[PDB]
Amino acid sequence: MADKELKFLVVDKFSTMRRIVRNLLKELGFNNVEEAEDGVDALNKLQAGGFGFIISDWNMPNMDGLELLKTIRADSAMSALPVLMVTAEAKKENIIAAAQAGASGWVVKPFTAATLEEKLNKIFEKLGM
Amino acid sequence: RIQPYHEFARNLPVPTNLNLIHLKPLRGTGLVVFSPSLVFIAVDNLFGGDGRFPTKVEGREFTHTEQRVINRMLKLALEGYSD
Amino acid sequence: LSGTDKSVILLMTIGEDRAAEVFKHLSTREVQALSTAMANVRQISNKQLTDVLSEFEQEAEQFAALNINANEYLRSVLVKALDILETRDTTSGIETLNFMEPQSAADLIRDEHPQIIATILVHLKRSQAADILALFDERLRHDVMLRIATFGGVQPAALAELTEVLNGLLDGQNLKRSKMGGVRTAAEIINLMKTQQEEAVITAVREFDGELAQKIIDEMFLFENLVDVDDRSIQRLLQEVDSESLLIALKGAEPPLREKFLRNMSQRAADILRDDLANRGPVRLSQVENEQKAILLIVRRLAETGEMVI
Amino acid sequence: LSGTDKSVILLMTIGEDRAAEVFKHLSTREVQALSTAMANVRQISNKQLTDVLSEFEQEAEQFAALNINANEYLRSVLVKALDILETRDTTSGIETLNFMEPQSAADLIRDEHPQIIATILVHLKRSQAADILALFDERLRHDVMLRIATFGGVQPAALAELTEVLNGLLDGQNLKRSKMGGVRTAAEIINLMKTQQEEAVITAVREFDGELAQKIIDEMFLFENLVDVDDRSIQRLLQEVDSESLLIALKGAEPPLREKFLRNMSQRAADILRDDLANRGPVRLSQVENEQKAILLIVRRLAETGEMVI
Amino acid sequence: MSQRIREMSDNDPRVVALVIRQWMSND
Amino acid sequence: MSQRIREMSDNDPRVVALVIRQWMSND
Numbered sequence: 001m002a003d004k005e006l007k008f009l010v011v012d013k014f015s016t017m018r019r020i021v022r023n024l025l026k027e028l029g030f031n032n033v034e035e036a037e038d039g040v041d042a043l044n045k046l047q048a049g050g051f052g053f054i055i056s057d058w059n060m061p062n063m064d065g066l067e068l069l070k071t072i073r074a075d076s077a078m079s080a081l082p083v084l085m086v087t088a089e090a091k092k093e094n095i096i097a098a099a100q101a102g103a104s105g106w107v108v109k110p111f112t113a114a115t116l117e118e119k120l121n122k123i124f125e126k127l128g129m
Numbered sequence: 130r131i132q133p134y135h136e137f138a139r140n141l142p143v144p145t146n147l148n149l150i151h152l153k154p155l156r157g158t159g160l161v162v163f164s165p166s167l168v169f170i171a172v173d174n175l176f177g178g179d180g181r182f183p184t185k186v187e188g189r190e191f192t193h194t195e196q197r198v199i200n201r202m203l204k205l206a207l208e209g210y211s212d
Numbered sequence: 213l214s215g216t217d218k219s220v221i222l223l224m225t226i227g228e229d230r231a232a233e234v235f236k237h238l239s240t241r242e243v244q245a246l247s248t249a250m251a252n253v254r255q256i257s258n259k260q261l262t263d264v265l266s267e268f269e270q271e272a273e274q275f276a277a278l279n280i281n282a283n284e285y286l287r288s289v290l291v292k293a294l295d296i297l298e299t300r301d302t303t304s305g306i307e308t309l310n311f312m313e314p315q316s317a318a319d320l321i322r323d324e325h326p327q328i329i330a331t332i333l334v335h336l337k338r339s340q341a342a343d344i345l346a347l348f349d350e351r352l353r354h355d356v357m358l359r360i361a362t363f364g365g366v367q368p369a370a371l372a373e374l375t376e377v378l379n380g381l382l383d384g385q386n387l388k389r390s391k392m393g394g395v396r397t398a399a400e401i402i403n404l405m406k407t408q409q410e411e412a413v414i415t416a417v418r419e420f421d422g423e424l425a426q427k428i429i430d431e432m433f434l435f436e437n438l439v440d441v442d443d444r445s446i447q448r449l450l451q452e453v454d455s456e457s458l459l460i461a462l463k464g465a466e467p468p469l470r471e472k473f474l475r476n477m478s479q480r481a482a483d484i485l486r487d488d489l490a491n492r493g494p495v496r497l498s499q500v501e502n503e504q505k506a507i508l509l510i511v512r513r514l515a516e517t518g519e520m521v522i
Numbered sequence: 523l524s525g526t527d528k529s530v531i532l533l534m535t536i537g538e539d540r541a542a543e544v545f546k547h548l549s550t551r552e553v554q555a556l557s558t559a560m561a562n563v564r565q566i567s568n569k570q571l572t573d574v575l576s577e578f579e580q581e582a583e584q585f586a587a588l589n590i591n592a593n594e595y596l597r598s599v600l601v602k603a604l605d606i607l608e609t610r611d612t613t614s615g616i617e618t619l620n621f622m623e624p625q626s627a628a629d630l631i632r633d634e635h636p637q638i639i640a641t642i643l644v645h646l647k648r649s650q651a652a653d654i655l656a657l658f659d660e661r662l663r664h665d666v667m668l669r670i671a672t673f674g675g676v677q678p679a680a681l682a683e684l685t686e687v688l689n690g691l692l693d694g695q696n697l698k699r700s701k702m703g704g705v706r707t708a709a710e711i712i713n714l715m716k717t718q719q720e721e722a723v724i725t726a727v728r729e730f731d732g733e734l735a736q737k738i739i740d741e742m743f744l745f746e747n748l749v750d751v752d753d754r755s756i757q758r759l760l761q762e763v764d765s766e767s768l769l770i771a772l773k774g775a776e777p778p779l780r781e782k783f784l785r786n787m788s789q790r791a792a793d794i795l796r797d798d799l800a801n802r803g804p805v806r807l808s809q810v811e812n813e814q815k816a817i818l819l820i821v822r823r824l825a826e827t828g829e830m831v832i
Numbered sequence: 833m834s835q836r837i838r839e840m841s842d843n844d845p846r847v848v849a850l851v852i853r854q855w856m857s858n859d
Numbered sequence: 860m861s862q863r864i865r866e867m868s869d870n871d872p873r874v875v876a877l878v879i880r881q882w883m884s885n886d
Contacts, residue, residue: 012188014187014188014189014190016144016188016189016190017144017187017188017189020143020144020188024143057188059187059351088185088186088187088188089185109185109186109187109188110142110143110144110145110164110165110166110186110188111142111143112139112140112141112142112143113138113139113141113143114139114140169325172325172327172328173325173327175366175367175370176325176327176328176330176331176366176370176374177327177330177331177363177364177365177366177703178327178359178364179359179362179363179364181358181362182326182355182358182359184325184326184327189323192323192324192325192328193377193380193381194324194325194328194373194374194377195325195328197373197377198373214882214886215879215881215882215883215884215885215886216882216883216886218882219878219879219882219883222867222875222878222879223879225864226867226868226875227868230868230872230875233872234872234875234876234879236872237872237873237876238876238879238880242879242880242883245883246879265863265864265867266863268867268875268878269863269867271878271881271882272870272874272878273568274567275565275566275567275568275877275881276566276567276568276570276571277870277871277874278534278535278565278566278571279534279563279564279565279566279873279874279877280534280873281873282560282561282562282563282564283561285534285538285541285560286557286560286561288538288542289533289538289541289542289545289557289560290542290545290557292538292539292542293541293542293543293545293546293553294545294553295558295561296557296558296561297561299558299561300561300562333711334701334702334703334707335701338707338710338711338713338714339711339714341711342711342712342713342714342715342719342720343714343715345711345715345719345723346715346716346718346719350722350726353723353726354723354726354727354730357708357723357726357727358727358730358731358734360703360707360708360711361703361704361705361708361727361734361738362703363701363703363707364700364703365698365700365701365703367698368697524855524859525852525854525855525856525857525858525859526855526856526859528855529851529852529855529856532840532848532851532852533852535837536840536841536848537841540841540845540848543845544845544848544849544852546845547845547846547849548849548852548853552852552853552856555856556852564877564880565877565881575836575837575840576836578840578848578851579836579840581851581854581855582843582847582851585850585854587843587844587847589846589847589850590846591846
């Protein structure tokens with residue numbers, strides 16, 4: 001089983017979506033969840049450290065999800081940190097670019113709690129958690 | 130399909146428009162669930178949308194005009210259900 | 213006296229019952245404006261009464277009274293024989309969605325459905341809709357443009373509902389009437405500080421957010437930027453600035469700004485100013501700052517009158 | 523004052539009962555138009571009353587009143603002794619199907635049965651039916667032409683039913699009265715944007731649909747197309763454009779357009795403009811864009827008056 | 833407001849309708 | 860304060876409303 005004290009960073013431009021994701025994570029047993037409004041704030045909070053999983057939106061102001069993922073992978077201290085990508089449009093080119101950047105998973109809005117739980121379980125199994 | 134409430138909640142896409150209704154004289158609260166895709170299609174049709182450019186759900190809250198459209202759709206649905 | 217003041221005096225001098233009857237034939241905006249103006253009335257002099265009464269008589273003769281209530285008369289005629297104010301209100305809302313700042317309207321309709329945004333912009337002026345679209349992101353702006361290109365028309369009921377929602381939002385905004393809280397207000401505050409605290413605040417804001425400080429800097433006139441102002445405006449400025457005040461202010465000015473001022477003066481006056489600068493002794497920084505503040509106030513006054521471009 | 527305004531004033535000044543009685547002798551379109559015009563009435567002055575009354579008296583004497591109701595009188599005479607407005611309405615619908623744009627009518631009747639299309643076009647003007655047929659596809663257009671060539675006549679009942687259906691469709695369209703949503707509206711919007719966002723929107727639309735962007739481009743006057751305008755119109759334009767405004771605008775213009783403007787000016791003025799262009803320093807792009815926008819506004823104003831052909 | 837208003841009020845409604853129709857046609 | 864005050868008090872409220880509207884528009 002995955003560690004229930006794992007710290008999650010939810011990054012999205014909409015506060016309501018972040019609250020929904022936090023509630024879904026709480027229903028799954030994860031209570032250590034922090035929220036970020038854009039890529040810059042997400043990177044600033046990542047520089048603090050202590051996070052074990054990232055859920056980030058694709059299109060965000062001042063930094064999109066792809067650039068944030070590239071910056072995370074470029075950092076040695078956070079290159080192995082799993083990142084979950086949530087988007088509104090599942091274009092093949094964007095998915096391929098994210099996979100080349102090192103995305104751990106992909107979620108398409110709208111989605112159900114079952115899909116999110118399945119994605120989290122698959123990511124944890126791939127990482128051996 | 131008949132299933133426990135938690136299973137029904139687990140299979141509802143999020144975010145979504147949830148409407149609480151009452152079926153008098155029966156006791157309890159009913160739910161009318163409107164998917165964001167249907168709401169966007171109705172908004173497109175009402176405001177001259179050609180339908181060639183579907184709107185992707187970004188996870189945002191419905192606007193006041195969208196809320197009024199949902200209102201109208203729900204009123205029609207409740208009238209049909211009652212009839 | 214403005215027309216609102218004359219109307220308020222007229223309403224105050226006709227009695228409460230007559231004023232109430234008149235309010236029944238006025239729109240909500242007019243009634244609210246008159247009530248607000250009636251609130252601040254403290255005295256009405258003899259001229260403010262007699263001239264208002266005479267002007268009211270001349271105005272009543274101007275359109276020769278008449279004009280029976282259009283809505284009730286039209287309804288009665290249609291009922292006996294067999295849009296309107298709703299159409300007029302929709303037209304006014306169309307006008308209201310064009311006099312606003314493009315940024316304010318864009319932020320108001322940024323979160324709306326792209327089809328709703330396209331529908332709103334179709335009924336707007338070309339320039340206003342062009343400015344609003346310029347402020348949207350690439351994807352949303354182009355989606356709205358494509359929806360406009362394939363706009364198929366909207367039923368009157370949906371348009372009326374959208375207009376009512378927009379009117380409610382506008383009423384809420386006007387009730388708020390958001391006092392200026394952007395970088396401009398801070399820049400105005402910062403410009404009136406002493407140089408020490410002004411520079412400290414600017415540096416600290418840049419430490420927190422360089423973009424925010426730059427926006428505040430771009431919205432502030434802290435002197436030393438008159439070099440970027442056109443020569444004609446500087447020449448106009450020199451006609452309102454005292455020679456001694458300019459001499460003291462230019463003592464602490466940079467050589468580029470000093471040459472900018474000198475180039476806009478007459479050659480004899482430029483030589484006199486150069487000699488005074490070379491001969492006058494050291495001046496306390498506070499006095500130079502005060503003179504620069506006075507010059508900036510003169511610049512602001514000229515800009516408000518349109519005689520100077522900043 | 524238009525005749526509609528005079529009629530509205532007359533109806534307002536005769537009383538509700540008299541106005542209702544008059545509406546009973548008017549067609550539905552006239553009643554709707556008067557009711558719409560009566561809705562926006564805010565004041566009727568002394569002249570707007572007296573002149574309207576005098577003109578009504580002179581008009582009543584013009585045709586000397588009389589003209590008892592034709593339908594009721596004819597029906598009574600026929601009943602006692604032994605088409606009409608239906609024929610007049612069919613004739614009006616025939617007229618209505620000729621004043622519309624050929625594209626609008628073609629799209630209206632594109633999905634109709636080919637025999638129905640042929641029947642409609644037989645009763646239409648030759649030019650209007652020719653234009654409508656030009657917009658149909660090869661197969662459908664030729665089928666309609668062949669059916670016209672063998673048109674054997676239609677019973678009055680079927681023609682009346684078709685006319686009623688067309689009248690209902692026209693009533694629906696007029697209730698919609700589709701606000702301009704084609705490429706022309708976007709082009710008008712795009713022309714009033716800054717060059718940055720205008721070019722970005724054009725490029726993005728071309729990325730989505732090159733044909734759509736080209737249609738918007740063909741419907742927009744973004745300057746630099748005055749080279750394709752005839753020499754006479756350019757010469758007319760130069761009489762309304764300030765010399766300094768033209769000098770600033772032509773600074774950023776292409777050499778072909780610059781020569782097009784120079785060739786339409788007098789030789790002395792052309793030499794003066796060339797010398798000014800060669801001697802004047804760099805001009806900010808925003809000022810040049812503003813001057814080009816002003817010149818385009820002048821061009822649009824001249825085109826609306828018929829003095830310039832675009 | 834002389835007697836002309838009263839005289840016009842007594843005219844046949846058909847005459848008024850025809851005057852209105854002619855005025856609208858002239859527009 | 861001559862009879863003009865009383866004469867103005869007897870005017871139709873719609874006339875007063877139209878005068879007020881014109882005055883506010885002229886501002």
